[PDB]
Amino acid sequence: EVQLQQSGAELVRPGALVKLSCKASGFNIKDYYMHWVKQRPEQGLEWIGRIDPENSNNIYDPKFQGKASITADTSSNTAYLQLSSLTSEDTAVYYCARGGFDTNHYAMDYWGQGTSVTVSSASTKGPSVFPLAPAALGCLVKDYFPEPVTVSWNSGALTSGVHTFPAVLQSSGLYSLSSVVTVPSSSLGTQTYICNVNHKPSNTKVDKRVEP
Amino acid sequence: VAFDVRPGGVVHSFSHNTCMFTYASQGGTNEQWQMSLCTIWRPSYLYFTQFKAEVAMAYSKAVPLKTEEFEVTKTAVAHRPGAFKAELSKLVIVA
Amino acid sequence: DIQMTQSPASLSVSVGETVTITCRASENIYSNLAWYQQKQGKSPQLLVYAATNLADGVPSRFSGSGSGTQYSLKINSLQSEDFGNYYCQHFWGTPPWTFGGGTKLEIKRTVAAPSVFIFPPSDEQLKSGTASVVCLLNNFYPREAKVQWKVDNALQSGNSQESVTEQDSKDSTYSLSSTLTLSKADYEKHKVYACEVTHQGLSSPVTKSF
Secondary structure, eight states: OOOOOOOOOEEEEETTTTTEEEEEEESOOOGSEEEEEOTTTTOOOOOEEEEEEETTEEEEEEEGTTTTEEEEEETEEEEEEOSOOOOOGOOOOEEEEESSBBBBTOOEEEOOOOEEEEEEEEBBOOEEEEEEEOOEEEEEEEEEEEOEEEEEEEEGTBBBEEEEEEEOOOOOEEEEEEEEEEEEEEGGGTTTOOOEEEEEETTTTEEEEEOO | OOEEESSOOOOOOEEEEEEEEEEEOOOOSSEEEEEEEEEEEOOOOEEEEEEEEEOOOOOOOOOOOOOGGEEEEEEEEEOOOOTTTTTOOOEEEOO | OOOOOESSSSSEETTTTTTEEEEEEESTTTTTTEEEEEETTOEEEEOOOTEHHHHHHHHEEEEEEEEEEEEEEEEOOOOOOEEEEEEEOOOOOSSOOOOOOOOEEEEEEBBBBBBBEOOOOOOHHTTTTTEEEEEEEEEEEESSSSEEEEEETOOOOEEEEEHHHHHTTTTTOOEEEEEEEEEEHHTTOOOEEEEEEEEOOOOOOEEEEE
């Protein structure tokens, strides 16, 4: 099975530098280009550059103005993207993707899961979890930084009728998100509803019981 | 079809339906070439250590190669070792 | 460099209809063109490569056509799960191997009115000095909806934020959450908290209050 496993989310200060990794499994990186693609929030895909791991030849879109450096380590079958002099324009999700060497193989068939990079001088902060008491009920995941927060209901056993909204950035500079679920009105009183909130950057894990 | 010529010394091949191009080269960048069906050309700054097109004329610029630089056989057009000057930009085969 | 112009930038098409998305290159790219689909929070997926070839596991309703500078992606018998963003990319000449600007595809369906719910701030939050009042608009279509907050019948402005979910893969609806933020002191100074909803699916606006 082919898999591209990317490194975890990054929170970095303006002017600083990051190095992202993309570990390949199920194929040899010397047999493909490894491409890197940027996607700014609410924007389109933008090709950054590529490396041929067999000969180390690497090339970029000139718009990056030497701010991106792509490397590869054949022993560990991993490709890397280093971004320097970071600005808010560099806040984006970065994907690695493998591609071939001829018309029928250039297109990138396998992609990494993406790595989120947030360029900010703000500190990490865990959320406060409040119930949205009931039919509809939910959880309010308030005042956290950086993104993201994951929400599940009844340890993932409750998925039908669940809506986990995109977070909003408050004037405080912290995010806030709501997760709701519609349930039968007759179950209010007998059925247990727990929202499972996880915010990895602050190592926060909260299980909140939502009662009428 | 387009195909990339990859320098570094590893022997590579590209084929299409059959016309096959086998080479090893050295240089600074991977170059996108084309194969039309057989004509193999750079739409070259690479230094070829070997070349063979199989199923004829060879050119350094698309400027023919000197007769001594290559050999045309029963099914192939290949570099003549020790005489080929490492520059190839176009190969034409009529079979 | 070669620039890719994707058209239209957005489309809203019903289940069973045909979708056509076009990509124009600034010069001849000799069919070195691919199409990708991307869903929210997911990696892009290859659909079509070398202008006309279906990638492994892609449904047969997808097809690509074109040559020279003009290319099209066609979706026959559109399904509810086909909403998302689509991008073309070229692989011609010296890189950059640029992407088109993208096409956002929405599934058009019949008008569905929202189910409206209002939530007071929890006692737990009030202890911290802040009050977040939430209004939920559930499973509606089209995406356009108006939420107006009222505090003791006084129309609110500048103290609310809202967010909308991605279109549902099965029923093609949207949900919206609006949060009214007040200090604990301001919250305790008033009695009636209301969320008034205006939507194409409603004969008259719907108010939920406590």
